[PDB]
mmCIF file with all atom_site columns, C-alpha atoms in Angstrom:
data_model
loop_
_atom_site.group_PDB
_atom_site.id
_atom_site.type_symbol
_atom_site.label_atom_id
_atom_site.label_alt_id
_atom_site.label_comp_id
_atom_site.label_asym_id
_atom_site.label_entity_id
_atom_site.label_seq_id
_atom_site.pdbx_PDB_ins_code
_atom_site.Cartn_x
_atom_site.Cartn_y
_atom_site.Cartn_z
_atom_site.occupancy
_atom_site.B_iso_or_equiv
_atom_site.pdbx_formal_charge
_atom_site.auth_seq_id
_atom_site.auth_comp_id
_atom_site.auth_asym_id
_atom_site.auth_atom_id
_atom_site.pdbx_PDB_model_num
ATOM 1   C CA . UNK P 1 1   ? -57.120  -1.928  59.204 1.00 0.00 ? 1   UNK P CA 1
ATOM 2   C CA . UNK P 1 2   ? -54.442  0.190   57.183 1.00 0.00 ? 2   UNK P CA 1
ATOM 3   C CA . UNK P 1 3   ? -55.354  3.542   58.956 1.00 0.00 ? 3   UNK P CA 1
ATOM 4   C CA . UNK P 1 4   ? -53.503  2.960   61.991 1.00 0.00 ? 4   UNK P CA 1
ATOM 5   C CA . UNK P 1 5   ? -56.663  1.678   63.823 1.00 0.00 ? 5   UNK P CA 1
ATOM 6   C CA . UNK P 1 6   ? -56.832  -1.221  66.413 1.00 0.00 ? 6   UNK P CA 1
ATOM 7   C CA . UNK P 1 7   ? -59.975  -3.385  66.612 1.00 0.00 ? 7   UNK P CA 1
ATOM 8   C CA . UNK P 1 8   ? -60.042  -2.701  70.255 1.00 0.00 ? 8   UNK P CA 1
ATOM 9   C CA . UNK P 1 9   ? -60.692  1.337   69.521 1.00 0.00 ? 9   UNK P CA 1
ATOM 10  C CA . UNK P 1 10  ? -63.708  0.294   67.525 1.00 0.00 ? 10  UNK P CA 1
ATOM 11  C CA . UNK P 1 11  ? -64.875  -2.384  70.166 1.00 0.00 ? 11  UNK P CA 1
ATOM 12  C CA . UNK P 1 12  ? -64.543  0.434   72.839 1.00 0.00 ? 12  UNK P CA 1
ATOM 13  C CA . UNK P 1 13  ? -66.791  2.949   70.699 1.00 0.00 ? 13  UNK P CA 1
ATOM 14  C CA . UNK P 1 14  ? -69.249  0.676   69.925 1.00 0.00 ? 14  UNK P CA 1
ATOM 15  C CA . UNK P 1 15  ? -69.488  -0.294  73.770 1.00 0.00 ? 15  UNK P CA 1
ATOM 16  C CA . UNK P 1 16  ? -69.532  3.437   74.636 1.00 0.00 ? 16  UNK P CA 1
ATOM 17  C CA . UNK P 1 17  ? -72.483  4.050   71.890 1.00 0.00 ? 17  UNK P CA 1
ATOM 18  C CA . UNK P 1 18  ? -74.307  0.963   73.252 1.00 0.00 ? 18  UNK P CA 1
ATOM 19  C CA . UNK P 1 19  ? -74.437  2.022   76.744 1.00 0.00 ? 19  UNK P CA 1
ATOM 20  C CA . UNK P 1 20  ? -75.409  5.618   75.872 1.00 0.00 ? 20  UNK P CA 1
ATOM 21  C CA . UNK P 1 21  ? -78.350  3.952   74.020 1.00 0.00 ? 21  UNK P CA 1
ATOM 22  C CA . UNK P 1 22  ? -79.274  2.412   77.081 1.00 0.00 ? 22  UNK P CA 1
ATOM 23  C CA . UNK P 1 23  ? -79.819  5.691   78.847 1.00 0.00 ? 23  UNK P CA 1
ATOM 24  C CA . UNK P 1 24  ? -82.929  7.671   77.430 1.00 0.00 ? 24  UNK P CA 1
ATOM 25  C CA . UNK P 1 25  ? -81.351  11.197  77.462 1.00 0.00 ? 25  UNK P CA 1
ATOM 26  C CA . UNK P 1 26  ? -78.317  10.133  75.314 1.00 0.00 ? 26  UNK P CA 1
ATOM 27  C CA . UNK P 1 27  ? -80.557  7.646   72.781 1.00 0.00 ? 27  UNK P CA 1
ATOM 28  C CA . UNK P 1 28  ? -82.681  11.112  72.357 1.00 0.00 ? 28  UNK P CA 1
ATOM 29  C CA . UNK P 1 29  ? -80.079  12.845  70.681 1.00 0.00 ? 29  UNK P CA 1
ATOM 30  C CA . UNK P 1 30  ? -78.518  9.620   69.371 1.00 0.00 ? 30  UNK P CA 1
ATOM 31  C CA . UNK P 1 31  ? -81.714  9.077   67.290 1.00 0.00 ? 31  UNK P CA 1
ATOM 32  C CA . UNK P 1 32  ? -81.537  13.270  66.175 1.00 0.00 ? 32  UNK P CA 1
ATOM 33  C CA . UNK P 1 33  ? -78.354  12.820  64.889 1.00 0.00 ? 33  UNK P CA 1
ATOM 34  C CA . UNK P 1 34  ? -79.163  9.682   63.009 1.00 0.00 ? 34  UNK P CA 1
ATOM 35  C CA . UNK P 1 35  ? -82.254  11.013  61.518 1.00 0.00 ? 35  UNK P CA 1
ATOM 36  C CA . UNK P 1 36  ? -80.231  14.113  60.282 1.00 0.00 ? 36  UNK P CA 1
ATOM 37  C CA . UNK P 1 37  ? -77.241  13.112  58.905 1.00 0.00 ? 37  UNK P CA 1
ATOM 38  C CA . UNK P 1 38  ? -76.173  9.851   60.668 1.00 0.00 ? 38  UNK P CA 1
ATOM 39  C CA . UNK P 1 39  ? -76.693  6.223   59.253 1.00 0.00 ? 39  UNK P CA 1
ATOM 40  C CA . UNK P 1 40  ? -76.882  2.859   60.737 1.00 0.00 ? 40  UNK P CA 1
ATOM 41  C CA . UNK P 1 41  ? -76.633  0.957   57.916 1.00 0.00 ? 41  UNK P CA 1
ATOM 42  C CA . UNK P 1 42  ? -73.042  2.083   57.481 1.00 0.00 ? 42  UNK P CA 1
ATOM 43  C CA . UNK P 1 43  ? -72.091  0.228   60.630 1.00 0.00 ? 43  UNK P CA 1
ATOM 44  C CA . UNK P 1 44  ? -73.320  -2.926  59.079 1.00 0.00 ? 44  UNK P CA 1
ATOM 45  C CA . UNK P 1 45  ? -71.704  -2.157  55.927 1.00 0.00 ? 45  UNK P CA 1
ATOM 46  C CA . UNK P 1 46  ? -68.475  -1.742  57.629 1.00 0.00 ? 46  UNK P CA 1
ATOM 47  C CA . UNK P 1 47  ? -68.627  -5.589  58.308 1.00 0.00 ? 47  UNK P CA 1
ATOM 48  C CA . UNK P 1 48  ? -68.398  -6.488  54.751 1.00 0.00 ? 48  UNK P CA 1
ATOM 49  C CA . UNK P 1 49  ? -64.835  -5.798  54.815 1.00 0.00 ? 49  UNK P CA 1
ATOM 50  C CA . UNK P 1 50  ? -62.964  -9.098  54.865 1.00 0.00 ? 50  UNK P CA 1
ATOM 51  C CA . UNK P 1 51  ? -59.841  -7.458  56.285 1.00 0.00 ? 51  UNK P CA 1
ATOM 52  C CA . UNK P 1 52  ? -61.306  -7.578  59.618 1.00 0.00 ? 52  UNK P CA 1
ATOM 53  C CA . UNK P 1 53  ? -61.981  -10.414 62.007 1.00 0.00 ? 53  UNK P CA 1
ATOM 54  C CA . UNK P 1 54  ? -65.443  -11.747 62.804 1.00 0.00 ? 54  UNK P CA 1
ATOM 55  C CA . UNK P 1 55  ? -65.269  -10.314 66.473 1.00 0.00 ? 55  UNK P CA 1
ATOM 56  C CA . UNK P 1 56  ? -66.097  -7.099  65.258 1.00 0.00 ? 56  UNK P CA 1
ATOM 57  C CA . UNK P 1 57  ? -68.990  -8.181  63.109 1.00 0.00 ? 57  UNK P CA 1
ATOM 58  C CA . UNK P 1 58  ? -70.062  -10.203 66.391 1.00 0.00 ? 58  UNK P CA 1
ATOM 59  C CA . UNK P 1 59  ? -70.046  -7.011  68.115 1.00 0.00 ? 59  UNK P CA 1
ATOM 60  C CA . UNK P 1 60  ? -71.865  -5.316  65.396 1.00 0.00 ? 60  UNK P CA 1
ATOM 61  C CA . UNK P 1 61  ? -74.569  -7.932  65.423 1.00 0.00 ? 61  UNK P CA 1
ATOM 62  C CA . UNK P 1 62  ? -74.894  -7.745  69.319 1.00 0.00 ? 62  UNK P CA 1
ATOM 63  C CA . UNK P 1 63  ? -75.189  -4.206  68.934 1.00 0.00 ? 63  UNK P CA 1
ATOM 64  C CA . UNK P 1 64  ? -78.431  -4.521  66.446 1.00 0.00 ? 64  UNK P CA 1
ATOM 65  C CA . UNK P 1 65  ? -79.814  -7.281  68.951 1.00 0.00 ? 65  UNK P CA 1
ATOM 66  C CA . UNK P 1 66  ? -79.210  -5.096  71.945 1.00 0.00 ? 66  UNK P CA 1
ATOM 67  C CA . UNK P 1 67  ? -81.003  -1.719  70.084 1.00 0.00 ? 67  UNK P CA 1
ATOM 68  C CA . UNK P 1 68  ? -83.794  -3.837  69.092 1.00 0.00 ? 68  UNK P CA 1
ATOM 69  C CA . UNK P 1 69  ? -84.364  -5.654  72.252 1.00 0.00 ? 69  UNK P CA 1
ATOM 70  C CA . UNK P 1 70  ? -84.419  -2.234  74.053 1.00 0.00 ? 70  UNK P CA 1
ATOM 71  C CA . UNK P 1 71  ? -86.855  -1.368  71.284 1.00 0.00 ? 71  UNK P CA 1
ATOM 72  C CA . UNK P 1 72  ? -89.372  -4.095  72.136 1.00 0.00 ? 72  UNK P CA 1
ATOM 73  C CA . UNK P 1 73  ? -90.394  7.374   69.841 1.00 0.00 ? 73  UNK P CA 1
ATOM 74  C CA . UNK P 1 74  ? -86.939  7.319   69.013 1.00 0.00 ? 74  UNK P CA 1
ATOM 75  C CA . UNK P 1 75  ? -87.035  3.531   68.852 1.00 0.00 ? 75  UNK P CA 1
ATOM 76  C CA . UNK P 1 76  ? -89.766  3.412   66.296 1.00 0.00 ? 76  UNK P CA 1
ATOM 77  C CA . UNK P 1 77  ? -87.653  6.007   64.411 1.00 0.00 ? 77  UNK P CA 1
ATOM 78  C CA . UNK P 1 78  ? -84.624  3.782   64.488 1.00 0.00 ? 78  UNK P CA 1
ATOM 79  C CA . UNK P 1 79  ? -86.660  0.876   63.535 1.00 0.00 ? 79  UNK P CA 1
ATOM 80  C CA . UNK P 1 80  ? -88.004  2.773   60.548 1.00 0.00 ? 80  UNK P CA 1
ATOM 81  C CA . UNK P 1 81  ? -84.648  4.047   59.596 1.00 0.00 ? 81  UNK P CA 1
ATOM 82  C CA . UNK P 1 82  ? -83.171  0.533   58.484 1.00 0.00 ? 82  UNK P CA 1
ATOM 83  C CA . UNK P 1 83  ? -85.565  0.863   55.638 1.00 0.00 ? 83  UNK P CA 1
ATOM 84  C CA . UNK P 1 84  ? -82.834  2.129   53.436 1.00 0.00 ? 84  UNK P CA 1
ATOM 85  C CA . UNK P 1 85  ? -81.275  -1.072  53.110 1.00 0.00 ? 85  UNK P CA 1
ATOM 86  C CA . UNK P 1 86  ? -83.067  -1.477  49.389 1.00 0.00 ? 86  UNK P CA 1
ATOM 87  C CA . UNK P 1 87  ? -81.414  1.589   48.427 1.00 0.00 ? 87  UNK P CA 1
ATOM 88  C CA . UNK P 1 88  ? -77.900  -0.027  48.949 1.00 0.00 ? 88  UNK P CA 1
ATOM 89  C CA . UNK P 1 89  ? -76.298  -0.992  45.849 1.00 0.00 ? 89  UNK P CA 1
ATOM 90  C CA . UNK P 1 90  ? -76.584  -4.886  44.832 1.00 0.00 ? 90  UNK P CA 1
ATOM 91  C CA . UNK P 1 91  ? -72.729  -5.478  44.975 1.00 0.00 ? 91  UNK P CA 1
ATOM 92  C CA . UNK P 1 92  ? -72.334  -4.210  48.490 1.00 0.00 ? 92  UNK P CA 1
ATOM 93  C CA . UNK P 1 93  ? -75.443  -6.224  49.580 1.00 0.00 ? 93  UNK P CA 1
ATOM 94  C CA . UNK P 1 94  ? -74.221  -9.393  47.974 1.00 0.00 ? 94  UNK P CA 1
ATOM 95  C CA . UNK P 1 95  ? -70.846  -9.269  49.574 1.00 0.00 ? 95  UNK P CA 1
ATOM 96  C CA . UNK P 1 96  ? -72.255  -8.514  52.848 1.00 0.00 ? 96  UNK P CA 1
ATOM 97  C CA . UNK P 1 97  ? -74.726  -11.357 52.703 1.00 0.00 ? 97  UNK P CA 1
ATOM 98  C CA . UNK P 1 98  ? -71.526  -13.770 51.375 1.00 0.00 ? 98  UNK P CA 1
ATOM 99  C CA . UNK P 1 99  ? -69.474  -12.448 54.376 1.00 0.00 ? 99  UNK P CA 1
ATOM 100 C CA . UNK P 1 100 ? -71.611  -13.955 56.822 1.00 0.00 ? 100 UNK P CA 1
ATOM 101 C CA . UNK P 1 101 ? -73.282  -16.894 54.895 1.00 0.00 ? 101 UNK P CA 1
ATOM 102 C CA . UNK P 1 102 ? -69.786  -18.563 53.957 1.00 0.00 ? 102 UNK P CA 1
ATOM 103 C CA . UNK P 1 103 ? -68.735  -21.348 55.947 1.00 0.00 ? 103 UNK P CA 1
ATOM 104 C CA . UNK P 1 104 ? -65.423  -20.591 57.881 1.00 0.00 ? 104 UNK P CA 1
ATOM 105 C CA . UNK P 1 105 ? -62.620  -22.916 57.534 1.00 0.00 ? 105 UNK P CA 1
ATOM 106 C CA . UNK P 1 106 ? -63.391  -18.261 64.405 1.00 0.00 ? 106 UNK P CA 1
ATOM 107 C CA . UNK P 1 107 ? -65.761  -20.972 63.839 1.00 0.00 ? 107 UNK P CA 1
ATOM 108 C CA . UNK P 1 108 ? -67.617  -20.450 66.890 1.00 0.00 ? 108 UNK P CA 1
ATOM 109 C CA . UNK P 1 109 ? -67.499  -16.766 66.295 1.00 0.00 ? 109 UNK P CA 1
ATOM 110 C CA . UNK P 1 110 ? -69.109  -17.413 62.973 1.00 0.00 ? 110 UNK P CA 1
ATOM 111 C CA . UNK P 1 111 ? -71.760  -19.555 64.519 1.00 0.00 ? 111 UNK P CA 1
ATOM 112 C CA . UNK P 1 112 ? -72.699  -16.940 67.007 1.00 0.00 ? 112 UNK P CA 1
ATOM 113 C CA . UNK P 1 113 ? -72.718  -14.132 64.204 1.00 0.00 ? 113 UNK P CA 1
ATOM 114 C CA . UNK P 1 114 ? -75.187  -16.503 62.056 1.00 0.00 ? 114 UNK P CA 1
ATOM 115 C CA . UNK P 1 115 ? -77.495  -16.892 65.237 1.00 0.00 ? 115 UNK P CA 1
ATOM 116 C CA . UNK P 1 116 ? -77.328  -13.219 65.606 1.00 0.00 ? 116 UNK P CA 1
ATOM 117 C CA . UNK P 1 117 ? -77.969  -12.321 62.132 1.00 0.00 ? 117 UNK P CA 1
ATOM 118 C CA . UNK P 1 118 ? -80.882  -14.567 62.068 1.00 0.00 ? 118 UNK P CA 1
ATOM 119 C CA . UNK P 1 119 ? -82.202  -12.827 65.217 1.00 0.00 ? 119 UNK P CA 1
ATOM 120 C CA . UNK P 1 120 ? -81.715  -9.314  63.710 1.00 0.00 ? 120 UNK P CA 1
ATOM 121 C CA . UNK P 1 121 ? -83.570  -10.683 60.438 1.00 0.00 ? 121 UNK P CA 1
ATOM 122 C CA . UNK P 1 122 ? -86.426  -11.807 62.955 1.00 0.00 ? 122 UNK P CA 1
ATOM 123 C CA . UNK P 1 123 ? -86.500  -8.619  64.553 1.00 0.00 ? 123 UNK P CA 1
ATOM 124 C CA . UNK P 1 124 ? -86.384  -6.341  61.279 1.00 0.00 ? 124 UNK P CA 1
ATOM 125 C CA . UNK P 1 125 ? -89.237  -8.645  59.954 1.00 0.00 ? 125 UNK P CA 1
ATOM 126 C CA . UNK P 1 126 ? -91.437  -0.810  60.752 1.00 0.00 ? 126 UNK P CA 1
ATOM 127 C CA . UNK P 1 127 ? -88.752  -1.850  58.205 1.00 0.00 ? 127 UNK P CA 1
ATOM 128 C CA . UNK P 1 128 ? -91.510  -2.832  55.532 1.00 0.00 ? 128 UNK P CA 1
ATOM 129 C CA . UNK P 1 129 ? -91.782  -5.832  53.226 1.00 0.00 ? 129 UNK P CA 1
ATOM 130 C CA . UNK P 1 130 ? -89.643  -4.019  50.187 1.00 0.00 ? 130 UNK P CA 1
ATOM 131 C CA . UNK P 1 131 ? -86.568  -4.607  52.058 1.00 0.00 ? 131 UNK P CA 1
ATOM 132 C CA . UNK P 1 132 ? -87.445  -8.374  52.801 1.00 0.00 ? 132 UNK P CA 1
ATOM 133 C CA . UNK P 1 133 ? -88.234  -8.829  49.254 1.00 0.00 ? 133 UNK P CA 1
ATOM 134 C CA . UNK P 1 134 ? -84.916  -7.420  48.147 1.00 0.00 ? 134 UNK P CA 1
ATOM 135 C CA . UNK P 1 135 ? -83.124  -9.545  50.613 1.00 0.00 ? 135 UNK P CA 1
ATOM 136 C CA . UNK P 1 136 ? -84.824  -12.764 49.464 1.00 0.00 ? 136 UNK P CA 1
ATOM 137 C CA . UNK P 1 137 ? -84.203  -11.728 46.007 1.00 0.00 ? 137 UNK P CA 1
ATOM 138 C CA . UNK P 1 138 ? -80.414  -11.166 46.388 1.00 0.00 ? 138 UNK P CA 1
ATOM 139 C CA . UNK P 1 139 ? -79.989  -14.344 48.742 1.00 0.00 ? 139 UNK P CA 1
ATOM 140 C CA . UNK P 1 140 ? -82.258  -17.022 46.594 1.00 0.00 ? 140 UNK P CA 1
ATOM 141 C CA . UNK P 1 141 ? -79.674  -17.093 43.469 1.00 0.00 ? 141 UNK P CA 1
ATOM 142 C CA . UNK P 1 142 ? -76.756  -17.174 45.971 1.00 0.00 ? 142 UNK P CA 1
ATOM 143 C CA . UNK P 1 143 ? -78.153  -20.008 47.910 1.00 0.00 ? 143 UNK P CA 1
ATOM 144 C CA . UNK P 1 144 ? -78.996  -21.734 44.610 1.00 0.00 ? 144 UNK P CA 1
ATOM 145 C CA . UNK P 1 145 ? -75.251  -21.494 43.503 1.00 0.00 ? 145 UNK P CA 1
ATOM 146 C CA . UNK P 1 146 ? -73.931  -22.707 46.720 1.00 0.00 ? 146 UNK P CA 1
ATOM 147 C CA . UNK P 1 147 ? -76.354  -25.651 46.766 1.00 0.00 ? 147 UNK P CA 1
ATOM 148 C CA . UNK P 1 148 ? -75.485  -26.329 43.054 1.00 0.00 ? 148 UNK P CA 1
ATOM 149 C CA . UNK P 1 149 ? -71.388  -26.101 42.638 1.00 0.00 ? 149 UNK P CA 1
ATOM 150 C CA . UNK P 1 150 ? -70.801  -26.507 46.635 1.00 0.00 ? 150 UNK P CA 1
ATOM 151 C CA . UNK P 1 151 ? -71.283  -29.301 49.184 1.00 0.00 ? 151 UNK P CA 1
ATOM 152 C CA . UNK P 1 152 ? -74.238  -27.479 50.533 1.00 0.00 ? 152 UNK P CA 1
ATOM 153 C CA . UNK P 1 153 ? -72.358  -26.047 53.742 1.00 0.00 ? 153 UNK P CA 1
ATOM 154 C CA . UNK P 1 154 ? -74.571  -23.987 55.755 1.00 0.00 ? 154 UNK P CA 1
ATOM 155 C CA . UNK P 1 155 ? -77.539  -24.997 53.533 1.00 0.00 ? 155 UNK P CA 1
ATOM 156 C CA . UNK P 1 156 ? -79.456  -26.346 56.749 1.00 0.00 ? 156 UNK P CA 1
ATOM 157 C CA . UNK P 1 157 ? -79.385  -23.015 58.546 1.00 0.00 ? 157 UNK P CA 1
ATOM 158 C CA . UNK P 1 158 ? -79.550  -20.826 55.373 1.00 0.00 ? 158 UNK P CA 1
ATOM 159 C CA . UNK P 1 159 ? -83.351  -22.040 55.087 1.00 0.00 ? 159 UNK P CA 1
ATOM 160 C CA . UNK P 1 160 ? -84.067  -20.354 58.528 1.00 0.00 ? 160 UNK P CA 1
ATOM 161 C CA . UNK P 1 161 ? -83.475  -16.992 57.495 1.00 0.00 ? 161 UNK P CA 1
ATOM 162 C CA . UNK P 1 162 ? -85.331  -17.250 53.959 1.00 0.00 ? 162 UNK P CA 1
ATOM 163 C CA . UNK P 1 163 ? -88.404  -18.681 55.383 1.00 0.00 ? 163 UNK P CA 1
ATOM 164 C CA . UNK P 1 164 ? -88.774  -16.125 57.933 1.00 0.00 ? 164 UNK P CA 1
ATOM 165 C CA . UNK P 1 165 ? -88.041  -13.425 55.186 1.00 0.00 ? 165 UNK P CA 1
ATOM 166 C CA . UNK P 1 166 ? -90.874  -14.972 53.377 1.00 0.00 ? 166 UNK P CA 1
ATOM 167 C CA . UNK P 1 167 ? -93.031  -14.984 56.366 1.00 0.00 ? 167 UNK P CA 1
ATOM 168 C CA . UNK P 1 168 ? -93.269  -11.037 56.316 1.00 0.00 ? 168 UNK P CA 1
ATOM 169 C CA . UNK P 1 169 ? -96.612  -9.501  55.611 1.00 0.00 ? 169 UNK P CA 1
ATOM 170 C CA . UNK P 1 170 ? -99.215  -11.827 54.050 1.00 0.00 ? 170 UNK P CA 1
ATOM 171 C CA . UNK P 1 171 ? -96.814  -14.158 52.770 1.00 0.00 ? 171 UNK P CA 1
ATOM 172 C CA . UNK P 1 172 ? -95.648  -13.163 49.374 1.00 0.00 ? 172 UNK P CA 1
ATOM 173 C CA . UNK P 1 173 ? -92.238  -14.277 49.661 1.00 0.00 ? 173 UNK P CA 1
ATOM 174 C CA . UNK P 1 174 ? -93.407  -17.800 49.625 1.00 0.00 ? 174 UNK P CA 1
ATOM 175 C CA . UNK P 1 175 ? -94.892  -17.252 46.134 1.00 0.00 ? 175 UNK P CA 1
ATOM 176 C CA . UNK P 1 176 ? -91.180  -17.161 44.755 1.00 0.00 ? 176 UNK P CA 1
ATOM 177 C CA . UNK P 1 177 ? -88.852  -18.674 47.363 1.00 0.00 ? 177 UNK P CA 1
ATOM 178 C CA . UNK P 1 178 ? -90.938  -22.105 47.383 1.00 0.00 ? 178 UNK P CA 1
ATOM 179 C CA . UNK P 1 179 ? -90.789  -22.201 43.508 1.00 0.00 ? 179 UNK P CA 1
ATOM 180 C CA . UNK P 1 180 ? -86.644  -22.098 43.841 1.00 0.00 ? 180 UNK P CA 1
ATOM 181 C CA . UNK P 1 181 ? -87.203  -25.186 46.222 1.00 0.00 ? 181 UNK P CA 1
ATOM 182 C CA . UNK P 1 182 ? -89.200  -26.628 43.101 1.00 0.00 ? 182 UNK P CA 1
ATOM 183 C CA . UNK P 1 183 ? -85.731  -26.646 41.227 1.00 0.00 ? 183 UNK P CA 1
ATOM 184 C CA . UNK P 1 184 ? -83.448  -27.077 44.595 1.00 0.00 ? 184 UNK P CA 1
ATOM 185 C CA . UNK P 1 185 ? -84.836  -30.441 46.090 1.00 0.00 ? 185 UNK P CA 1
ATOM 186 C CA . UNK P 1 186 ? -84.888  -31.787 42.450 1.00 0.00 ? 186 UNK P CA 1
ATOM 187 C CA . UNK P 1 187 ? -81.326  -30.780 42.137 1.00 0.00 ? 187 UNK P CA 1
ATOM 188 C CA . UNK P 1 188 ? -80.724  -32.778 45.451 1.00 0.00 ? 188 UNK P CA 1
ATOM 189 C CA . UNK P 1 189 ? -82.216  -35.642 43.558 1.00 0.00 ? 189 UNK P CA 1
ATOM 190 C CA . UNK P 1 190 ? -79.670  -35.553 40.868 1.00 0.00 ? 190 UNK P CA 1
ATOM 191 C CA . UNK P 1 191 ? -77.153  -35.580 44.071 1.00 0.00 ? 191 UNK P CA 1
ATOM 192 C CA . UNK P 1 192 ? -78.800  -38.619 45.669 1.00 0.00 ? 192 UNK P CA 1
ATOM 193 C CA . UNK P 1 193 ? -80.004  -40.527 42.549 1.00 0.00 ? 193 UNK P CA 1
ATOM 194 C CA . UNK P 1 194 ? -76.365  -41.390 41.858 1.00 0.00 ? 194 UNK P CA 1
ATOM 195 C CA . UNK P 1 195 ? -75.131  -45.292 42.211 1.00 0.00 ? 195 UNK P CA 1
ATOM 196 C CA . UNK P 1 196 ? -72.069  -44.136 44.091 1.00 0.00 ? 196 UNK P CA 1
ATOM 197 C CA . UNK P 1 197 ? -74.395  -41.861 46.497 1.00 0.00 ? 197 UNK P CA 1
ATOM 198 C CA . UNK P 1 198 ? -76.576  -44.752 47.029 1.00 0.00 ? 198 UNK P CA 1
ATOM 199 C CA . UNK P 1 199 ? -73.748  -47.287 47.774 1.00 0.00 ? 199 UNK P CA 1
ATOM 200 C CA . UNK P 1 200 ? -72.218  -44.734 50.126 1.00 0.00 ? 200 UNK P CA 1
ATOM 201 C CA . UNK P 1 201 ? -75.484  -44.411 51.918 1.00 0.00 ? 201 UNK P CA 1
ATOM 202 C CA . UNK P 1 202 ? -75.941  -48.187 51.901 1.00 0.00 ? 202 UNK P CA 1
ATOM 203 C CA . UNK P 1 203 ? -71.896  -34.029 50.860 1.00 0.00 ? 203 UNK P CA 1
ATOM 204 C CA . UNK P 1 204 ? -74.838  -36.725 50.083 1.00 0.00 ? 204 UNK P CA 1
ATOM 205 C CA . UNK P 1 205 ? -76.122  -36.369 53.575 1.00 0.00 ? 205 UNK P CA 1
ATOM 206 C CA . UNK P 1 206 ? -75.957  -32.610 53.201 1.00 0.00 ? 206 UNK P CA 1
ATOM 207 C CA . UNK P 1 207 ? -77.970  -32.694 50.001 1.00 0.00 ? 207 UNK P CA 1
ATOM 208 C CA . UNK P 1 208 ? -80.459  -35.071 51.700 1.00 0.00 ? 208 UNK P CA 1
ATOM 209 C CA . UNK P 1 209 ? -80.846  -32.680 54.699 1.00 0.00 ? 209 UNK P CA 1
ATOM 210 C CA . UNK P 1 210 ? -81.202  -29.679 52.260 1.00 0.00 ? 210 UNK P CA 1
ATOM 211 C CA . UNK P 1 211 ? -83.789  -31.521 50.257 1.00 0.00 ? 211 UNK P CA 1
ATOM 212 C CA . UNK P 1 212 ? -85.749  -32.284 53.373 1.00 0.00 ? 212 UNK P CA 1
ATOM 213 C CA . UNK P 1 213 ? -85.755  -28.423 54.447 1.00 0.00 ? 213 UNK P CA 1
ATOM 214 C CA . UNK P 1 214 ? -86.727  -27.744 51.087 1.00 0.00 ? 214 UNK P CA 1
ATOM 215 C CA . UNK P 1 215 ? -89.749  -30.326 51.030 1.00 0.00 ? 215 UNK P CA 1
ATOM 216 C CA . UNK P 1 216 ? -90.404  -29.169 54.583 1.00 0.00 ? 216 UNK P CA 1
ATOM 217 C CA . UNK P 1 217 ? -90.832  -25.451 53.348 1.00 0.00 ? 217 UNK P CA 1
ATOM 218 C CA . UNK P 1 218 ? -93.017  -26.649 50.565 1.00 0.00 ? 218 UNK P CA 1
ATOM 219 C CA . UNK P 1 219 ? -95.282  -28.608 52.913 1.00 0.00 ? 219 UNK P CA 1
ATOM 220 C CA . UNK P 1 220 ? -95.402  -25.552 54.870 1.00 0.00 ? 220 UNK P CA 1
ATOM 221 C CA . UNK P 1 221 ? -96.579  -23.293 52.186 1.00 0.00 ? 221 UNK P CA 1
ATOM 222 C CA . UNK P 1 222 ? -99.019  -25.756 51.015 1.00 0.00 ? 222 UNK P CA 1
ATOM 223 C CA . UNK P 1 223 ? -100.527 -26.379 54.622 1.00 0.00 ? 223 UNK P CA 1
ATOM 224 C CA . UNK P 1 224 ? -101.249 -22.694 54.474 1.00 0.00 ? 224 UNK P CA 1
ATOM 225 C CA . UNK P 1 225 ? -102.639 -22.698 51.075 1.00 0.00 ? 225 UNK P CA 1
ATOM 226 C CA . UNK P 1 226 ? -105.254 -25.710 52.197 1.00 0.00 ? 226 UNK P CA 1
#
């Protein structure tokens, strides 16, 4: 934001480039340029800057949603171009994930951005399974840390992305994430077995809901196994 740039300028350029994505003749050269030197992952990386409002991230996520909706030869190449997400450094990916996963104190904009990110994760899952595996591995420790130290804000909506990511391919992701639940639910038990929590019942509710979600994921894995 210190480069003399107003958010409206970026909003305008994303609208223009989405509009030219709509047309076939323009999206042709769009794909040629992004396969030659461009990178759509840079636009997603730009949203990791905490100095910018959530509206820019909202527009960026809507841009991914729109291009993937238009996808469903240039579109297939664009879908395959996103496979470079694994090549990103762990720090940048972790920062980008924490930017959206963190519960805001723009709460509606944050919820819309989370829904758009879920839709984008669903659409991504020609990308391949390596990106999904890397994302699951990068998100599991963070979710565990958030459920342990924090009050579990956003945990009920966090499992939706993780289960869909584990659903990629033949289901290898459930081989790991479910194991995490094997601890996570127990941790929620450590949150609900206290006398104070029991007396209050007669963040504890959030812990119980997270435990219920983890158990539902485990049951979903078991049903597939049986």
